[PDB]
Amino acid sequence: TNPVLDVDGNELQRGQLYYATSVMRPGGGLTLAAPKGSCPLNVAQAPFDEYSGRPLAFFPENADDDTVQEGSTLYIMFPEPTRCPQSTVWTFDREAGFVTTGGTTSKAIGPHNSRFAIRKAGSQPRDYQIEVCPCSTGVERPSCRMGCLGTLGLAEGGKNVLLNINNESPHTIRFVKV
Amino acid sequence: TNPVLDVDGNELQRGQLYYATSVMRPGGGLTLAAPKGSCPLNVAQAPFSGRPLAFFPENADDDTVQEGSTLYIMFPEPTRCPQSTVWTFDREAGFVTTGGTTSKAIGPHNSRFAIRKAGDDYQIEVCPCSTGVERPSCRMGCLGTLGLAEGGKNVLLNINNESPHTIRFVKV
Numbered sequence: 001t002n003p004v005l006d007v008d009g010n011e012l013q014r015g016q017l018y019y020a021t022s023v024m025r026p027g028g029g030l031t032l033a034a035p036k037g038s039c040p041l042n043v044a045q046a047p048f049d050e051y052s053g054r055p056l057a058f059f060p061e062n063a064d065d066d067t068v069q070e071g072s073t074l075y076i077m078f079p080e081p082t083r084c085p086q087s088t089v090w091t092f093d094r095e096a097g098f099v100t101t102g103g104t105t106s107k108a109i110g111p112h113n114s115r116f117a118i119r120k121a122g123s124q125p126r127d128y129q130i131e132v133c134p135c136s137t138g139v140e141r142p143s144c145r146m147g148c149l150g151t152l153g154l155a156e157g158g159k160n161v162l163l164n165i166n167n168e169s170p171h172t173i174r175f176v177k178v
Numbered sequence: 179t180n181p182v183l184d185v186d187g188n189e190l191q192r193g194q195l196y197y198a199t200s201v202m203r204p205g206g207g208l209t210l211a212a213p214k215g216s217c218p219l220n221v222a223q224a225p226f227s228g229r230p231l232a233f234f235p236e237n238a239d240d241d242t243v244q245e246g247s248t249l250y251i252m253f254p255e256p257t258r259c260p261q262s263t264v265w266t267f268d269r270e271a272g273f274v275t276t277g278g279t280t281s282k283a284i285g286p287h288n289s290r291f292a293i294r295k296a297g298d299d300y301q302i303e304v305c306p307c308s309t310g311v312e313r314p315s316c317r318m319g320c321l322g323t324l325g326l327a328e329g330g331k332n333v334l335l336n337i338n339n340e341s342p343h344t345i346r347f348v349k350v
Contacts, residue, residue, distance in 0.1 A: 015195070015230075015255070059256050079254030080193060081234050081264045081289075085277040089256045102260040114256075 001138070003067045004118050005126045006175045012068035017055035017079065017178035023127050024172065029053020032078060032088065032101070033160040039084035043099040045154055045161040045171075054078050055178050059105075061115065062139050072138025073115040075105060076130075089114055092132045098155060098162040109142045111135055117148065121172045129170040130163075179310075180245040182293050184349040190243035193254070195230035195350035201300075202344070210253060210263065210276065211332045217259040221274040223326060223333040223343075229253055230350050236280075236290065237311045247310030248290040250280060251302075264289055267304045267321075272336035274324065284314040292320060301342045 003011040006018060020030045028046030030053040046053040058068050059075040068074060076090040082101075089103030091114040103114030111134030121127040133148040153166025163171065181189040184196060198208045200223070207228015210219035233243050234250040243249060253263035257276075264278030266289040278289030286306030294301055305320035323342035327334045335343070 057254065075256040077254070077256060079232065079252075081250040081252055081278065081280045082262060083280050085262055085264075085279050087257060087260055087262045103256070104260055105256045105258050 001072070002070045002120075004070055004128060004175065006177050007126070008177065009126075010177070012058060012175060014059060014066045014068070015057050017057055018175040019052040019054075019178060020056055020173045021051060021053075021176050022171070023121075023174060025051075027154075030056065030163075032082060034084075035159060040086040040101045041082060041084050041088075042101070042160070043090055043163050044157075045163075052176060054080065058118075060138070061105075061136050065138070068118060069138055070119055071117055073117050073133050073136045075103065075114055076116055077103070090116060092116075092134075092149065094149075098157075098164045099152065107141065109144055111144050111146070121170065126174060127172045128174070129172055132165060180295075182243040182245055182299055182347070184299075184347045186349060188349070190233055190347060190349075192241045192243075193232040193234055195232060195254070197228045197348040197350065198231055198345050199228065199348050200343070200345055201296075205326075205333070208335075210257065210259075212259070213331065218261040218276040219257065219259050219263075220276070220332070221265055221335050223335075225333065229255065234280075235310070236308050240310065243293065244310055246292050246294060248292050248305050248308050250278060250289055251291050252278070265291060267291075267337075269337075273327065274335035282308075282313055285316055286318060291324075294323075296342075296344050299346050300344050302345075304337060 028050045031046045032041035033044035061073045078088040086102035091103030093100045106112040117133045130152045131148045135144040150165040151170040152163040155162045155164035205225035209229040211222040212219040251265040261277035266278035281287040292305045303320040307318045308315040322339045325338035325341045325343040327336040
């Protein structure tokens with residue numbers, strides 16, 4: 001299909017570092033947050049003065065893909081150390097309704113909450129959204145058939161802006177290579 | 179304050195990928211391995227390339243890995259295990275494991291490592307006390323150099339000073 005592209009038109013290399021800049025730009029990139037001494041960290045939108053947030057890297061579930069493909073499932077992480085011991089791999093906590101850490105790879109046919117996909121939003125430039133897709137896709141192995149949970153939007157949280165499922169108001173983003 | 183250098187001779191940059199290839203060549207790089215369906219994974223040796231590594235100086239402003247400055251070490255890739263891939267040395271069984279954390283503790287912290295030359299890179303020390311950082315820090319010298327440990331399904335990293343596993347760094 002169609003790869004995802006950065007602001008520079010280049011493809012999204014597997015493992016390289018990219019900032020998730022907010023399209024709706026009075027807004028910051030993505031980072032990790034929790035109150036002092038709380039674990040695990042959740043995925044949160046930085047305050048406005050941090051346009052880039054922290055770097056992310058993407059890992060298509062399909063091993064021969066070395067670019068990220070639209071609609072195909074992948075893993076996401078902040079490849080940095082952290083004050084908490086959980087992995088910085090994104091996973092969708094279905095009880096809490098937002099994205100938290102401690103995610104895992106999985107090859108199984110069962111749905112898995114660390115599986116995300118990226119899709120275009122809109123015509124051009126290169127805007128995208130992130131979908132929560134428990135069932136692998138773009139993957140040449142048995143996969144469960146149900147659809148995605150839906151699209152990540154910004155979620156007013158109190159101390160932080162988090163990412164929940166919001167289909168009408170998705171958080172649209174661009175990728176800026178690092 | 180001598181910057182650690184890759185094989186191409188440039189200074190290790192903050193959190194970029196570098197294989198940890200072996201000097202003595204009955205073996206090669208480093209990776210994570212654990213018994214089937216067990217967690218967390220341990221840092222293990224691949225005895226012929228490996229999985230890449232990033233380095234993270236405690237001093238938030240150090241971009242270049244200085245020699246002897248404490249840093250965090252991790253495999254910045256996803257994993258079948260829910261622990262972070264940050265290295266940590268809990269001295270329960272002596273094996274470098276995963277699930278490390280940053281810390282500004284003044285006390286010792288299990289995930290603090292350093293890199294010293296083997297003789298005018300090259301080896302890795304478990305230094306629980308922060309060095310080369312602004313903040314308060316305890317005074318202990320490093321606990322010792324890391325090296326190989328066998329007897330089971332995989333070669334791990336425990337503390338063994340008279341046999342320090344030497345390496346050089348290959349920027350990706």
